[PDB]
Amino acid sequence: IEKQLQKDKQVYRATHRLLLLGADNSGKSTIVKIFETKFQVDKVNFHMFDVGGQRDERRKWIQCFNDVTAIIFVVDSSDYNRLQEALNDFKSIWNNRWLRTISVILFLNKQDLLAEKVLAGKSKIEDYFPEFARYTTPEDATPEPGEDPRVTRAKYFIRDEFLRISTASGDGRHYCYPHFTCAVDTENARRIFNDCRDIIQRMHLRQYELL
Amino acid sequence: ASIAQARKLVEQLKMEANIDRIKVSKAAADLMAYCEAHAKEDPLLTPVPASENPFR
Amino acid sequence: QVQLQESGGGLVQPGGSLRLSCAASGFTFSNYKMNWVRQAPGKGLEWVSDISQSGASISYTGSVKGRFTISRDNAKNTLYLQMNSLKPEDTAVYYCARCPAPFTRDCFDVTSTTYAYRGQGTQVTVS
Amino acid sequence: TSFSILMSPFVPSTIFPVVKWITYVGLGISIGSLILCLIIEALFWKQIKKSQTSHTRRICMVNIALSLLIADVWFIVGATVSGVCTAAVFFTHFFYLSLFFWMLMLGILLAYRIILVFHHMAQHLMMAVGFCLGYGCPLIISVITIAVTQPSNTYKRKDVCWLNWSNGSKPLLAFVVPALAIVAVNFVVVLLVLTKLWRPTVGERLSRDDKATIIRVGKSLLILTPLLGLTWGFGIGTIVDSQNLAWHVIFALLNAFQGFFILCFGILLDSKLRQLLFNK
Amino acid sequence: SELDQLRQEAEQLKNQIRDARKACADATLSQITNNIDPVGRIQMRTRRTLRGHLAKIYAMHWGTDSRLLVSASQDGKLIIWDSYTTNKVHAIPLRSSWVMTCAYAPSGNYVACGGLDNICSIYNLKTREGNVRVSRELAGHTGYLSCCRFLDDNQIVTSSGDTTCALWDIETGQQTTTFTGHTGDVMSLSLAPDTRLFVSGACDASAKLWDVREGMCRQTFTGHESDINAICFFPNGNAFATGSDDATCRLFDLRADQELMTYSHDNIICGITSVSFSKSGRLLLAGYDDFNCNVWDALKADRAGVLAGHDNRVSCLGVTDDGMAVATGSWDSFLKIWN
Ligand SMILES: [C][C][C][C][C][C][C][C][C][C][C][C][C][C][C]C(=O)O[C][C]([O])[C]OP([O])(=O)O[C][C]N([C])([C])[C]
């Protein structure tokens, strides 16, 4: 009976568990390409869970995901009304006592839809977020080629606003990796693999206390 | 709806009130009586020889 | 038993001032982070502002940033919220919510219609 | 007696008593430092978390600490004292190589955990190769040296009993070249760690100018230098000339204070261990 | 204003109920139990360390013979343990990796598990072939299964995250009786020694007493102020101890229908995960989030011992039927037997 457990030990450690949580309109299923999904990239398996079969009370079953490699947070920038709600959800996940040692990979899903919204001008970010008027595009930020300057400023403001909560607390135990995703993108699996590889590298350095 | 769930709470509260409650002093004594009556057979409360213990 | 009572509310002219008072009983008020949430008609509940245990960490949502003033009174277990420059969009039912876990800065009070730690709330109407 | 004779064939006559006095005080604090380190490791052996990476670095810490203690005490007794003097050469030479090869294991493990993060191979087999090569390879080098140069009488220094640099025999560089090879591989490992930590990670920005990156980089650099033996890199500076007083003094000072460095940096700076020490 | 009138009537009823509790609330158990001598300091040692679980052991359960131990871990493996000799009697892989509860039948033939899959899977341990298979699959809960207990071989009661409790028949496979009335996620329930009635604690800071046969909420206790995670009856069966996330353990009496004693200490700021009673009920053991357990006195509310040695949060603990030993399972994938 010990031989079977030894074989399962290698499989359990080889695979990496990921938690997929976000708003319904954020398009969580789009990130992948019952609710359980599996994808393998660069000869290492990545195993991802999307918990949608429970109620809105998520303060109890979220403790079951304190051993996952990372949390995949999917947020939609096309709806400014629910953007604040997602920020509160991100703040709760980031500041959770049992999730304080888990890095979060943030996806700005459907960034393509945000382009028309800011170019049309009917909806203004400043109405919902007063800080957008004073906000300026960072020098380190790289604007997308073939994109309006207002598009870059609008999308980076949301990314920066999410990162303010990330830098507010954590003490370096866990890190946030923000990414921009369009309606269709085949690099989502590669980006998850790169961040997960980065997370493991930082974990060993922290374990050695070099970090 | 909202009125439906509030109705169930009222009915439950009426039933809760009708139960006769025994005095705490009598109830507290019953718990104390059980503790002293079963104190000797409890292995954690009282010292036990290692021979009787199968874990040592 | 944990019970939260909200006082005040009522019809208010736009640009007026309202001071909602939240009464806390059955628990130590000083040990829990407290929040205010409103539910607009035909819309889900949304978080407004929060107060830390000692009041050091206070934050507001983007829609009431600067307009709203909030504070806690640990002496008599009361939570106070001051609303200024009322607008028609502010017309909603304001609930007084408490984070479940003591000594924590994280809670999930945004939950809709299923929360035992949220008071009944008061209706605020802006003309 | 100078402690620089390990990496320098000749030491200046005027500089030799000065560096020797620095050596004697340096061993005094180091030996006490190593005794404290062994007690802390032994008391907190079961207190550490049951992690594959955490356990293997801990056994590397004690083995480096254990090798340093025995090598240092046997070096002192050899300097004070014909048979007993020359007998201590084999053990002192073997223990120092064991310390060097154990320091390589810490460097290789640090590089392996970074270069290959998904290669979760067997911990028990990986422990075996660390003990096998950490001690067996220095033992192989030591026995080969005595097998060839001991009958030739070139294995013995005149009243010093250390590997010499003269005549047809080449005992000294037979020990030095492995030592420099370990430092060269450990310096490359250190540079790899700096590559990962050079990029700021506080919300994809420094947020405190270059000061935030430097202070985080600086803390890692202090920890890495004694554990991986970067202080032994100054030996090449003093071996090329063998007459520079400035090169000699810094080499003897840091290596003698390595035991103090290990306790102050490898133990005190250990965040998990400091809180555990406070609880006890 | 019909809804407002109904709420006012409920508030008046609560005041009348509260007055009823205070009418018979003369004296306290602490005042009565002051004359008896303290139990004193209790020294406990880890006789057996059960190793082999890949992930955290979220739930565990003891056997009726005080020998077989079953533990559920997030790795997807359900292991039945031989506590006396520290051997794995059986290893049951799980279809769903996330399991939150595990139960061992009083006869020992059946073992149950449940978690985020919203399904209470039951395995037969006494099959003729000898290999463990899913004897019966229970579905119908819309929330995660938090706790399940075996009333008998054919009847099982489960608490789910949909604020409801259900009684399931193994042969039928459907819920015979549904216990509704909780306003929060039910986290734990305990079975009375006579199995006539049971109480379930939810995330609404209240414990409701239920009767299995009638399926009605006999009594409701509101003494805590945070999410309730631990429920356990007194060995007498007329009282139970409840631990919550507010770092307090409270003992309630069924006949008194009020709070008897509170087991809290100022330095404790960590919530309760699991509670249990000894053979006599005088010794109270509670799980904590401070990586260790505390031993309490049920009659004096003072600390008598500390169960250290766990490298993570103590998720679960249990005491044998005969009280021979207490087993503690934490999130470090280790089970420790204490005596
Ligand atoms: C206890 C004591 C401490 C210590 C112990 C020991 C450890 C080490 C051993 C393992 C070994 C490593 C490697 C892996 C395997 C293989 O082969 O794979 C390939 C690669 O190699 C490939 O990759 P590359 O590129 O080559 O990399 C290299 C780097 N290193 C560092 C890893 C070597």
Cα angle value E279/E285/E289 (rounded, 5°): 160
A11-40 as b/e: b if 16+ CB within 10 A:
ebeeebbbbbbbbeebbbebbeeeeebeee
Q: Is the CB of D60 under 6 A from ligand 1?
A: yes
- List alpha helices for chain E, DSSP H: 2-23, 29-32
SS3 for B19?
A: coil
Q: Are C124 and C94 in contact (CB under 8 A)?
A: yes
Q: Which two tokens stand for residue D39?
A: 């007690």
Q: Which two tokens stand for residue E146?
A: 């938090």
SS3 for E309?
A: coil
Touching partners of B (3+ C-beta pairs < 8 Å): E
- What domains does chain A contain, in order, with CATH numbers? 1-208 (3.40.50.300)
Question: What amino acid is encoded at D207 in this protein?
Answer: S
Contact call for C108 and A128, based on CB within 8 A? no
The closest of D149, D190, D189 to D172, measured between CA atoms, is D149
Q: Backbone phi, then psi, for E229, in 5-degree steps? A: -120, -15
Question: In what helix (H) or strand (E) does residue B17 lie, and over which residues does it extend?
Answer: helix B2-18
Question: Which residues on neighbouring strands pair with residue E220, listed in sequence order?
Answer: E208
Q: At what angle do helices D52-80 and D83-115 cross, to 10 degrees?
A: 160
| Domain assignment present for C112 | no
**How do strand C69-73 and strand C78-84 relate by DSSP bridges?**
antiparallel
The closest of D176, A100, C91, D240 to E313, measured between CA atoms, is A100
Assign residue C74 the CATH number of its domain: 2.60.40.10
Cα angle value E28/E30/E35 (rounded, 5°): 120
Q: Is the CB of D111 under 6 A from ligand 1?
A: yes
CA distance C83 to B9: 34
Task: Please tell me the distance in Å from C60's CA to the nearest CA on chain A.
Answer: 11
Q: How far apart are the first and last CA of chain B?
A: 60
CA distance E177 to E164: 11
**How do strand E145-150 and strand E120-124 relate by DSSP bridges?**
unpaired
- Cβ burial of D274 (10 Å; 0-12, 13-18, 19+) is exposed
CA distance E12 to B53: 56
Contact call for C100 and E7, based on CB within 8 A? no
CA distance C66 to E55: 47
Query: Which CATH architecture is the domain D15-279 placed in?
Result: Up-down Bundle (1.20)
CA distance D169 to D172: 9
Question: In what helix (H) or strand (E) does residue E138 lie, and over which residues does it extend?
Answer: strand E134-138
CA distance D64 to A54: 52
Q: Are D54 and A207 in contact (CB under 8 A)?
A: yes
Quickly count: other Cβ atoms within 10 Å of residue D113's Cβ: 20
CA distance E330 to E288: 10
CA distance C119 to C103: 21
Question: In what helix (H) or strand (E) does residue D236 lie, and over which residues does it extend?
Answer: helix D235-241
Q: Which residues contact C126 (CB under 8 A, 6 or more apart)?
A: C12, C13, C14, C86, C87, C88, C90, C91
Question: In what helix (H) or strand (E) does residue D192 lie, and over which residues does it extend?
Answer: helix D171-198
Q: Which two tokens stand for residue B40?
A: 């000797």
Touching partners of E (3+ C-beta pairs < 8 Å): A, B, C, D
CA distance A102 to A96: 10
CA distance E30 to E32: 5
Q: How far apart are the first and last CA of chain C?
A: 37
Task: Please tell me the distance in Å from D10's CA to the nearest CA on chain A.
Answer: 38
Q: Which of A56, A84, A89 sits opposite C62 (nearest CB)?
A: A84
Long-range contact list for D243-249, CB < 8 A, 24+ apart?
Answer: D243/D10, D243/D12, D245/D12, D245/D14, D245/D15, D248/D2, D248/D4, D248/D8, D248/D11, D248/D12, D248/D15, D248/D19, D249/D15, D249/D18, D249/D19, D249/D22
Task: Please tell me the distance in Å from A56's CA to the nearest CA on chain C.
Answer: 6
Question: What amino acid is encoded at D1 in this protein?
Answer: T
Question: What amino acid is encoded at E259 in this protein?
Answer: E
Per the structure, how many domains does chain B have?
1
Contact call for E235 and B38, based on CB within 8 A? yes
The closest of D231, D211, D237 to D68, measured between CA atoms, is D231
Q: How far is the CA of D178 from the centre of ligand 1 (A)?
A: 19
CA distance E32 to B28: 8
**Solved using:** cryo-EM
Q: Are D104 and D185 in contact (CB under 8 A)?
A: yes
Written as one string, the DSSP assignment of chain C is --EEEEE--EEE-TT-EEEEEEEEESS-GGGS-EEEEEE-TTS-EEEEEEE-SSSS-EEE-TTSTTT-EEEEETTTTEEEEEEES--GGG-EEEEEEE-SSTT-S---TT--S--TTB---EEEEE-
SS3 for D112?
A: helix
Say yes or no: C111 contacts chain A, CB-CB below 8 A. yes
CA distance A86 to A76: 9
Per DSSP, D262 falls in state I
Residue A86 CA from chain centroid, whole number: 11
Q: Are E144 and E161 in contact (CB under 8 A)?
A: yes
Q: Are C93 and A79 in contact (CB under 8 A)?
A: no
SS3 for D67?
A: helix
Say yes or no: E217 contacts chain B, CB-CB below 8 A. yes
Q: Is the CB of D62 under 6 A from ligand 1?
A: no
CA distance E66 to E304: 24
- Cβ burial of D107 (10 Å; 0-12, 13-18, 19+) is buried
- Reported as half-sphere exposure (CB side, CA atoms, 13 A), residue E229 has a value of 28
Contact call for B54 and E14, based on CB within 8 A? no
Contact call for D224 and A13, based on CB within 8 A? no
Q: How far is the CA of A174 from the centre of ligand 1 (A)?
A: 27
Quickly count: other Cβ atoms within 10 Å of residue A125's Cβ: 24
The closest of D134, D112, D140, D142 to D62, measured between CA atoms, is D134
Q: Are E87 and E118 in contact (CB under 8 A)?
A: no
Distances E46 to E65, E314, E325, E338 between C-alpha atoms, Å: 20, 15, 10, 5
In angstroms, what is the resolution? 3.1
Quickly count: other Cβ atoms within 10 Å of residue A136's Cβ: 9
Q: Are E116 and A61 in contact (CB under 8 A)?
A: yes
- Reported as half-sphere exposure (CB side, CA atoms, 13 A), residue D14 has a value of 4
Q: Which two tokens stand for residue D215?
A: 């202070």
| Domain assignment present for C62 | yes
**How do strand A44-50 and strand A70-76 relate by DSSP bridges?**
unpaired
Q: Are E316 and E58 in contact (CB under 8 A)?
A: yes
* Residues on A contacting C at a C-beta cutoff of 8 Å: 55-59, 84-85, 88-89, 91-92, 95-97, 128-131, 169
Q: Are E284 and E295 in contact (CB under 8 A)?
A: yes
Q: Is the CB of D143 under 6 A from ligand 1?
A: no
Q: Are D134 and D98 in contact (CB under 8 A)?
A: yes
The closest of E213, E188, E162 to E101, measured between CA atoms, is E188
Measured between beta carbons, which residues in chain E are less than 8 angstroms from residue A4? 91
User: What is the residue with the minimal CA distance to atom 5 of ligand 1?
Assistant: D130
Q: According to the 3-state scheme, what is the secondary structure of chain A?
A: CHHHHHHHHHHHHHCEEEEEEECHHHCHHHHHCCCCEEEEECCEEEEEEECCCCCCCCCCHHHHHCCCCEEEEEEECCCCCCHHHHHHHHHHHHCCCCCCCCEEEEEEECHHHHHHHHHHCCCCHHHHCCHHHHCCCCCCCCCCCCCCHHHHHHHHHHHHHHHHHHHHCCCCCCCEEEEECCCCCCCHHHHHHHHHHHHHHHHHHHHCCCC
CA distance C109 to A57: 9
Q: Where are the domains of chain E?
A: 1-338
Say yes or no: A166 contacts chain D, CB-CB below 8 A. yes
CA distance D101 to D178: 9
The closest of A195, A169, A172 to A91, measured between CA atoms, is A169
The closest of D272, D257, D99 to D178, measured between CA atoms, is D99
Note down the domain range covering B35: 1-56
**How do strand C34-39 and strand C92-98 relate by DSSP bridges?**
antiparallel
Quickly count: other Cβ atoms within 10 Å of residue D228's Cβ: 23
Contact call for A85 and C46, based on CB within 8 A? yes
Query: Which CATH architecture is the domain E1-338 placed in?
Result: 7 Propeller (2.130)
CA distance D249 to A164: 50
CA distance B38 to A127: 70
- Cβ burial of E10 (10 Å; 0-12, 13-18, 19+) is middle
Q: How far is the CA of D108 from the centre of ligand 1 (A)?
A: 7
What's the length of chain B? 56
Q: Are C37 and C50 in contact (CB under 8 A)?
A: no
| Domain assignment present for C124 | no
CA distance C87 to C77: 29
The CA R_g of chain B, rounded to the nearest whole Å, is: 23
Q: Which of C26, C103, C120 sits opposite E225 (nearest CB)?
A: C26
Q: Which two tokens stand for residue E186?
A: 């039910």
Note down the domain range covering C42: 3-103
Q: Are A182 and A110 in contact (CB under 8 A)?
A: yes
Task: Please tell me the distance in Å from A56's CA to the nearest CA on chain D.
Answer: 29
User: Which residue in the block uniquely carries the two structure tokens 């602490």?
Assistant: E30
Q: At what angle do helices D171-198 and D83-115 cross, to 10 degrees?
A: 30
Measured between beta carbons, which residues in chain D are less than 8 angstroms from residue A14? 118, 120
User: Which residue in the block uniquely carries the two structure tokens 């005094």?
Assistant: D28
Question: Which residues on neighbouring strands pair with residue A17, listed in sequence order?
Answer: A47
CA distance E141 to E122: 15
Quickly count: other Cβ atoms within 10 Å of residue D126's Cβ: 14
Q: Which two tokens stand for residue D2?
A: 């100078």
The CA R_g of chain C, rounded to the nearest whole Å, is: 14
- List alpha helices for B19-43, DSSP H: 24-37
Best probe of the C interface among A59, A66, A81, by most C CBs < 10 A, is A59
Q: At what angle do helices A149-168 and A111-120 cross, to 10 degrees?
A: 120
Q: How far is the CA of A193 from the centre of ligand 1 (A)?
A: 21
Q: Is the CB of D107 under 6 A from ligand 1?
A: no
The closest of D82, D79, D106, D75 to D223, measured between CA atoms, is D106
Quickly count: other Cβ atoms within 10 Å of residue A123's Cβ: 13
The closest of E306, E307, E327 to E317, measured between CA atoms, is E327
Q: Which two tokens stand for residue E1?
A: 């204003």
Torsion sign (Cα): B42, B47, B49, B50: positive
- CA of D130, closest atom in ligand 1: 2
Per DSSP, E116 falls in state T
Q: Which two tokens stand for residue B7?
A: 């109705």
Quickly count: other Cβ atoms within 10 Å of residue D91's Cβ: 16
Measured between beta carbons, which residues in chain A are less than 8 angstroms from residue E185? 55, 57, 60
Q: How far is the CA of D192 from the centre of ligand 1 (A)?
A: 14
Q: Are A164 and A116 in contact (CB under 8 A)?
A: no
| Domain assignment present for C119 | no
Question: In what helix (H) or strand (E) does residue E202 lie, and over which residues does it extend?
Answer: strand E197-202
Distances C59 to C29, C62, C110, E92 between C-alpha atoms, Å: 18, 10, 15, 49
Best probe of the A interface among E57, E58, E71, E75, by most A CBs < 10 A, is E75
Q: How far apart are the first and last CA of chain E?
A: 61
Quickly count: other Cβ atoms within 10 Å of residue E93's Cβ: 12
CA distance E241 to E172: 33
The closest of E311, E279, E272 to E294, measured between CA atoms, is E272
B21-55 as b/e: b if 16+ CB within 10 A:
beebbebbebbbebbeebbeebbbbeeeeeeeeeb
- Cβ burial of D58 (10 Å; 0-12, 13-18, 19+) is middle
Q: Is the CB of D212 under 6 A from ligand 1?
A: no
Per the structure, how many domains does chain C have?
1
User: What is the residue with the minimal CA distance to atom 24 of ligand 1?
Assistant: D115
Contact call for A209 and D269, based on CB within 8 A? yes
| Domain assignment present for C39 | yes
Q: Which residues contact E205 (CB under 8 A, 6 or more apart)?
A: C1, C2, C116, C117, E184, E222, E224, E225, E226, E227, E228, E244
SS3 for D157?
A: coil
Q: Which residues contact A148 (CB under 8 A, 6 or more apart)?
A: A115, A118, A119
CA distance D156 to C11: 102
Task: Please tell me the distance in Å from E337's CA to the nearest CA on chain D.
Answer: 18
CA distance C79 to C21: 6
Do A and B touch, 3+ Cβ pairs within 8 Å? The answer is no
Residue of E nearest to D48 (CA): E311
Contact call for A92 and C46, based on CB within 8 A? no
